[PDB]
Swiss-Prot record:
Domain notes: The FERM domain mediates the interaction with phosphatidylinositol 4,5-bisphosphate.
Intracellular or extracellular location(s): Cell projection, Dendritic spine
Domain FERM: 9-324
Pathological association: Intellectual developmental disorder, X-linked 104: A form of intellectual disability, a disorder characterized by significantly below average general intellectual functioning associated with impairments in adaptive behavior and manifested during the developmental period. Intellectual deficiency is the only primary symptom of non-syndromic X-linked forms, while syndromic forms present with associated physical, neurological and/or psychiatric manifestations.
Superkingdom, taxonomy of origin: Eukaryota
Residue window of the full protein shown: 196 to 526 of 1322
Organism whose genome encodes this protein: Homo sapiens
Subunit structure: Interacts (via C-terminus) with DLG1, DLG2, DLG3 and DLG4/PSD95. Interacts (via N-terminus) with ARHGEF7; the interaction is mediated by the PDZ domain. Interacts with GPSM2 (via TPR repeat region).
Stated name of the protein: FERM and PDZ domain-containing protein 4
Role summary: Positive regulator of dendritic spine morphogenesis and density. Required for the maintenance of excitatory synaptic transmission. Binds phosphatidylinositol 4,5-bisphosphate.
Signal peptide interval: none
């Protein structure tokens, strides 16, 4: 079996709505090429927000996403380690700081962001920072949004949701394993009704306006458009293990203490002038961050983490700082 290909030289790409798409490649096709073909198929204007990623299945349950560079060749992608048992996903990797800005810009991309976020929320792709409290509240809106776009009833019925979709589809595994089904349904019952109580003075919440609310809750969070990396900081040729957080509100920052959400800026995206990677022992990659008014910062990282750091940093630079200028170029 092979999760990455349909066949020799035909790439399988999963969209966030469950669709699959195929791309014939030869030895010259780049990830950039497939992204442009997907921009055209899907009528996207904000392609700068999007990336192709590999889905790694880790030993314990849960997936790790490996960002792929545009200049990277598809053949070069099938040679990553155990490419055959990973999947290719098209996803928004560089989120706008306020979701509403995407909606006025590319509605297709905004709808794409809402569908991807729902999947992210239910599959616990945010940390435990997503408390069951928020998770149920998010579910009540996802549930609302699924109903108003399928039935005229503006009043939401768990019994419908139970049959048509399955309640479990809107809930994380943790609520499923920890909360009592009766307790979950009571919780949703009070929630949906209370939000229903918030709306009567107002005209009914449109699905689109509900989706805006769904993504605003998500936008105030740590792993929103962001990732956590282990890395080895080399400072005066001696080594220490660091945890980096790269995201839209953190530039490249370092986690000092999770308990107090203590994060330290190492570099705003605007202060990054270049990223360079080299090779070391046993798929260990040395990253050198060239930052304004400081000596370069040196990181020793596992190769796929090294690449997801460059991509995510270059991705947010292209988005938030300058669309033309390059910071990272593989060769």
């Amino acid at each position: 079996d092979n999760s990455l290909l349909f066949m020799p030289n035909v790439l399988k790409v999963y969209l966030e709505n469950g669709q699959t798409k195929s791309f014939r490649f030869d030895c010259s096709t780049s990830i950039k090429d497939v992204i442009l073909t997907l921009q055209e198929k899907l009528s996207i204007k904000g392609i700068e927000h999007f990336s192709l990623m590999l889905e790694q299945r880790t030993e314990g349950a849960g997936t790790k996403l490996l960002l792929l560079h545009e200049q990277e060749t598809l053949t070069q992608v099938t040679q990553r380690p155990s490419s055959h048992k990973m999947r290719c996903l098209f996803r928004i990797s560089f989120v706008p700081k306020d979701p509403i800005d995407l909606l006025r810009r590319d509605p297709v991309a905004f709808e794409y962001l809402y569908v991807q976020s729902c999947n992210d929320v239910v599959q616990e792709r945010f940390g435990p920072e997503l408390k069951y409290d928020i998770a149920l509240r998010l579910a009540a809106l996802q549930m609302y949004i699924a109903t108003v776009t399928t039935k005229q009833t503006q009043k939401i019925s768990l019994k419908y949701i139970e049959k048509e979709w399955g309640l479990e589809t809107f809930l994380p595994s943790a609520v499923l394993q920890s909360m009592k089904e009766k307790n979950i349904k009571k919780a949703l019952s009070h929630l949906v009704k209370a939000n229903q109580n918030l709306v009567p003075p107002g005209k009914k919440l449109s699905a689109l306006q509900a989706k805006v609310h769904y993504l605003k809750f998500l936008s105030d969070l740590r792993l929103y458009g962001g990732r956590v990396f282990k890395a080895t900081l080399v400072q005066a040729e001696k080594r220490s293990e660091v945890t980096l957080l790269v995201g839209p509100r953190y530039g490249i920052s370092h986690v000092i203490n999770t308990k107090t959400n203590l994060v330290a800026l190492l570099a705003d995206f605007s202060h990054v002038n270049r990223i360079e990677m080299f090779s070391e022992e046993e798929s260990l990659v040395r990253v050198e961050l060239h930052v304004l008014d400081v000596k370069p910062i040196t990181l020793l990282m596992e190769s796929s983490d090294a690449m997801n750091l460059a991509c995510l940093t270059a991705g947010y630079y292209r988005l938030l700082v300058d669309s033309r200028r390059s910071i990272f170029n593989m060769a």
